[model samples]
Target: GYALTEGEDYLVLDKPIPQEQSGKIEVLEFFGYFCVHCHHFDPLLLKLGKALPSDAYLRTEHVVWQPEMLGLARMAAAVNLSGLKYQANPAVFKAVYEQKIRLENRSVAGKWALSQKGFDGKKLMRAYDSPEAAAAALKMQKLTEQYRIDSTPTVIVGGKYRVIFNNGFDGGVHTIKELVAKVREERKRQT
Candidate 1:
């Protein structure tokens, strides 16, 4: 069990959110582009995503805490639809955190998306204006409320447990792996 504590290492959710994927375990990452901490945690998450086994899938949900963030979330949702997370997100993160660019509107954000490599500008524009993008961004609000998420970079494992980075970023990755293993066994017993 890796000698993990309940409250210190993680918290068992009172209401478990159903996994988005049918067969694989979901590692849901709640973050916001405006959050500097989330920007810093980005690399760690990328590493964690790479390290996670095939049974686990890492998905990101941008938490909409402010009006500006809501716009960013919509653009991010568009990026998700265009399917260029790793390729384009780092540039977005750099522009926001390091370069101080404001990308809270369709025109500006769309221009930014068009600048990235391998980003389907046409697809992004289509999805950005679609109802699906709005719904996906708004769902962040619902999930933030349902999960009682107070901060950025919140990690939810298998939709059942919330990870606390008590042992710092390195330990957080270890904790996630441990929890994934636990969830795997849990599903094994359930089936």
Candidate 2:
């Protein structure tokens, strides 16, 4: 449980992930469903995740400020437990923002999960109901509130400074490059 500097916030997990092995910096992306901006940033976030330094830990915090949002957050937690967050996150975004599917509906999220290739609907259902998913969703909700996030696609670097983007960026990919540059500069200063 390391902390960010003053005037900055740290990413605190309810179930802490090992930070000892995490020698590199940590970046937390605060996002929400029903956000067209988040949908656009999804792919770029994935790419960044893949290319980040080995010690760097990049994770997503699904913001749930309302009942509907909480439901969607639970769906995301379920997807993560099913080992499909990497494979299905973009699909979920597409289903909501591109296809205009009603993601607020649990059934809709369930259906989308099932539609994924090699996905088992029954296993997904079991995982969705398990304590692990519930705990993850609850933990994420608390983190969302703790971060005091007001918008989607807010990138928090090293759990400290937050980078807010204007809508001019075509999508999250460009924004990520910009954010990474900032991180590089900050790391340099720290070193």
Candidate 3:
């Protein structure tokens, strides 16, 4: 654990997380849509990602641990590639937690991106098989290693501090927003 000056609490990683830009702080949220806890925090995650300053990027990486999860992540990568993430992503969460659908079944999951939206099967498939989608799916193993994440819904701020979650939203100081704000303040101290 790193020393905190005041009004800040989160675990400091011994090895630093990568940043895409020099000034911007990268917040990598290692989560899985299949998990209930992760689903519970989905709306808040979206809010935080959108509200953060331009310099701060709150990126979500869906963790695929098993072969079944690989399929889900693959679909997610493809949806992102097809530029349907805004609609498809949240649906993935809702399909699981709300509708109680077992999305691991390809037949069930396949319908989500296309049937709900007006996206054609052929075009969406093209994007899914494109180099971009393949690249995103291929990185599962390496990203998992880099984050060394043991649990879902963990929010790592500025690639330096990882906020440990007590539940979906409650942590005395470990709440996601509080931890994110604390990291921003810490970044100020650095520059």
Q: State TM-scores per candidate.
A: 0.88, 0.71, 0.75
lDDT of each: 0.81, 0.64, 0.65
- Any idea what lDDT model 2 has? 0.64
C-alpha displacement of 64 in model 3, angstroms?
1.9
TM-score-based ranking: 1, 3, 2
| Model 2 Cα lDDT, one tens digit per residue, 1-191 | 22223333323332332222244666667777668878876777777877876656577767888755676777677776877667677767777677878765777767766776755655666677788877888887877676566678767655544554434424334544544455566667542
Model 3 — TM-score against the truth? 0.75
Residue 49 lDDT in candidate 3 = 68
Stretches off by above 4 angstroms in model 1 are: 118-123
Cα error of candidate 1 at position 40, Å: 1.5
Better of 1 and 3 by TM-score: 1
Worst 10 residues of 1 by lDDT: 113-122
Comparing 2 and 3 by lDDT, which wins? 3
Q: Over all chains combined, what TM-score does candidate 1 have?
A: 0.88
Which ranges of candidate 2 are over 4 A from the true structure?
1-22, 118-123, 166-191
